[PDB]
Ligand binder design. Structure first.
Ligand code: A1BEO
Ligand code: A1BEO
Ligand code: PLM
Ligand code: PLM
Ligand code: FE2
Ligand code: FE2
Lengths: 508, 504
């Protein structure tokens, strides 16, 4: 066995419109749903890929659909509702595309999209669906009703914020976004506090804690996520640049800087100060940090990388993802290559070590060379590398190991950009585990710990799987044992489920 | 699972020995394959001081030629110092006369301690200078000194010439074009029976990144159609060259990274493709081959621009284990890397990955300035654990698609294991015994083999632990590196670098 093939083309169902439900369906359980598993798997993704005869072009254009699998006493329900954003509501009103999406211009001031199709996260006692703009949407996690639109610009100085905020155990939320900060561009870290006794909305207490500089005065890098430890914030500035100068959509504004490579930045979290260490390495795209942690006076930075400066999103138009298998493979031939990489950033830079490798840790092959111009050139330790086989959408045991020394990551395996397997990676030994079934296309795995867990990987991962082959249920919730990715149960439904990006498990 | 060497036996690798007058019989354990007939010839330092005057660097000790003979399941061992100018004059004057790599004498060295290779019907021991030494492969007698400058325009040549099946020899060396690098070609022995070295010629020249500073070059790549040269940031400062030794002339260029160069072998033409990547040291190419208009370039790399030789002074290699580990903490990290070089550069693909091969994660980005930026596929990576001194089934798979490489495993620069690497699957095999320090493994095919790894590997092992024979020849099955036999001797054997198996 080598290359897994998908000639039947079932992955097309990931990109096909569905209708919302009026109320939850019961799901047919096979195997055994863990009896300790009590709560809601909430996930976001596109659900409407055209408004009548007007199509959406890009993967990130379809209208936000909020999904929920509920678990109780070994039984499972499924429910979904479109998020009532301005983009969706106005589209349903005017029966056309009203708001410009990432890769779809709307034809008839700057009406920025609030299509919150990417992720959902808690703030205080509330939950917010999001994309990557200034608009986030408050949602009801039980009914999936849309509550309110929130403009972050009303509270803090950012043009947007990522769909990947970090959330500390006390409920503090950290996020990053491009801003104006000289009349130069910069990146601001936003901090949203936990809900206090006064019970006021935490978003009204938002503040900028630290600012990162920009490599280009007028062009911020695209930032999808960032790293957080107890003491440090890590930001990776990639050569994918947003041209603020330039019937255009967002996608038309991106360009690749050929000469800058990647700049890595650290800030002291507690002292709220940028550290002027000029970390540099070769060009790559970065969407998802896996995890970050401190080891002696070094930051361990585990990344899902794409080797090259070409923007990976160029390969994610719906027309291309809907092609037949042979064409899908051909399309990916010249794309950046995915690779899981560990970078190690020294915090203590001694001039006496100019010209030498500063990474004195015993358990890594990552290096960091102090140059005479004071730049620190980084080389990674490669943890996982497969030909056009990405370990993507990484997840860990976040609550206990986020920002801390860890061993295990879980991922969605992309086969020429098509999700077709689930993966587990031991980041110390590089051992992997895989779950895969033919004609089955899974989603990001989310880890849920066993309540009496002793080890890091004592629990399950949850994934939403599309399996449209005739003589099969069209979709199901997959439960794997986190130890070995062995199948524990499925909760089958008799309707299609389109692609979802990110989500969370809300314990009850 | 760090392997430790507190007993410090590796120090015997760097201890002077005496030559033999004639071969010793070796005590065989296990079974020597009966098809194994010939001589394992290997070179290394054997004399690490001249009286009270010490040699300082690993590459300074006086060349010692070793030989294990195999016949009908029996093994002999023999060694003789090579009678170079450096050795002869040292024995005459009872001091260090010629400056060695890292030892100034208080006249370029011909201390041929590195390798031995065939030219026509002859065998030459070599270092990396213009002087190579003809030797008798049966008696180990020194025959004569040859100056390559008498024949071709090069200042020196590597100890890693490529040798085609017909006997054609290719090598590279720095020269004067500006500085440049010349490929030397020595033809096979013809019917006229004249010395092939007298028919030497420069076939192609590579340009230099710096007008006055050539990169150090230890080896290069060769396929049926192409020559691959890797120009590293380790530079030789000819100004500071012309009480200094060779080591004092090296410096690291911080900004250039690595430049890769290809030349058309048959059309004898340099190809102006500006391949670029991040900085590393390179000593040993593993293998090179052509795959559908791409060159696959497998390298043993060291991550960084600091010269790895800085860590190879004898004083440092002789320290106790805890000190040896501490010394290597800030050294470049070893890594086996596969680079893929596109031969077809289309402007229409500017900004994109040109490596469309299905079986690699290596990339090559065409930039607007026309440089091609390379990223490798990593084949092997261990913390301060080098897969080094690589060997393949060279006669049948050299320059061609291949699967298997064999290597010496370096533990903080100390050789302590033998390794096999599947370069397609990245599966490895290991042979290792405590207090045993092996040498470069050399692959010998079963003469009727159709498979790539159907044979044995030979390694010379030092094992000085009390209640043991001090050294032995190890024979492993090439399939799984399982032990087949040993040929034990009752004398020490110092470190050897490279060599060959001469079939008889
Ligand atoms: C040009 C400004 C950028 C960044 C501030 C922006 O807003 O980019 C998006 C605009 C709309 C949607 C999206 C999707 O969420 C991307 C997929 N995760 C990104
Ligand atoms: C500075 C000029 C260079 C030529 C590139 C040179 O001559 O370097 C050496 C001089 C003497 C000995 C050696 C050893 O063989 C190195 C270890 N294999 C190298
Ligand atoms: C589950 C998605 C399958 C379709 C193809 C996915 C390709 C993803 C490429 C790398 C990750 C880029 C970020 C997308 C997810 C997000 O919006 O957070
Ligand atoms: C077997 C030698 C052990 C001692 C330390 C060896 C470290 C070698 C570093 C990489 C290879 C450098 C070139 C040395 C061999 C040669 O001269 O051809
Ligand atoms: Fe994401
Ligand atoms: Fe060598």
């Amino acid at each position: 066995s080598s290359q897994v093939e998908h000639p039947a083309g079932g992955y097309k169902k990931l990109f096909e419109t569905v209708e919302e439900l009026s109320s939850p369906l019961t799901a047919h359980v096979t195997g055994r749903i863990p009896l300790w598993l009590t709560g809601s798997l909430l996930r976001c993704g596109p659900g409407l890929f055209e408004v009548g005869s007007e199509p959406f072009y890009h993967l990130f254009d379809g209208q936000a659909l909020l999904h929920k699998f509920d678990f109780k006493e070994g039984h499972v329900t499924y429910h979904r509702r479109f998020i009532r954003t301005d983009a969706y509501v106005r589209a349903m009103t005017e029966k056309r595309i009203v708001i410009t999406e990432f890769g779809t211009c709307a034809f008839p001031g700057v009406e920025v999209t609030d299509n919150a199709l990417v992720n959902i996260y808690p703030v205080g006692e509330d939950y917010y669906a999001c994309t990557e703009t200034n608009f986030i949407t408050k949602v009801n996690p039980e009914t999936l009703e849309t509550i309110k639109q929130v403009d972050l610009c009303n509270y803090v100085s950012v043009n947007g914020a990522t769909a990947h905020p970090h959330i500390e155990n006390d409920g503090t939320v950290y996020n990053i976004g491009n801003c104006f900060g000289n009349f130069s561009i910069a990146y601001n870290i936003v901090k949203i506090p936990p809900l206090q006794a006064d019970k006021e909305d935490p978003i009204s207490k938002s503040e900028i804690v630290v600012q990162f500089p920009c490599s280009d005065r007028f062009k911020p890098s695209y930032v999808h996520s960032f790293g957080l430890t107890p003491n440090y914030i890590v930001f990776v500035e990639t050569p994918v640049k947003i041209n603020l100068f330039k019937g255009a959509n967002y996608m038309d504004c991106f360009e690749s800087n050929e000469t800058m490579g990647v700049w890595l930045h650290i800030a002291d979290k507690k002292r709220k100060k940028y550290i002027n260490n000029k970390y540099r390495t070769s060009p790559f795209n970065l969407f998802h940090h896996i995890n970050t942690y401190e080891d002696h006076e070094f930051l361990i930075v585990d990344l899902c990388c794409w080797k090259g400066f070409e923007f990976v999103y160029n390969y994610l138009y719906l027309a291309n993802l809907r092609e037949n298998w042979e064409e899908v493979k051909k399309n990916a031939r010249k794309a950046p290559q995915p690779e899981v990489r560990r970078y190690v950033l020294p915090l203590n830079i001694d001039k006496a070590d100019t010209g030498k490798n500063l990474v004195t840790l015993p358990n890594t092959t990552a290096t960091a060379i102090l140059c005479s111009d004071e730049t620190i050139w980084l080389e990674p330790e490669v943890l996982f590398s497969g030909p056009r086989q990405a370990f993507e959408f990484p997840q860990i045991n976040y609550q206990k190991y986020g920002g801390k020394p860890y061993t295990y990551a879980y991922g969605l395996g992309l086969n020429h950009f098509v999700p077709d397997r689930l993966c587990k990676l031991n980041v110390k030994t590089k051992e992997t585990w895989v779950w895969q079934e033919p004609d089955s296309y899974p989603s990001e795995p989310i880890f849920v710990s066993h309540p009496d867990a002793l080890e890091e990987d004592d629990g399950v991962v949850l994934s939403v799987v599309v399996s449209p082959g005739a003589g099969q249920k069209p979709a199901y919730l997959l439960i794997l044992n986190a130890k070995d990715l062995s199948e524990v149960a499925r909760a089958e439904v008799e309707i299609n489920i389109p692609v979802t990006f990110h989500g969370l498990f809300k314990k009850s």
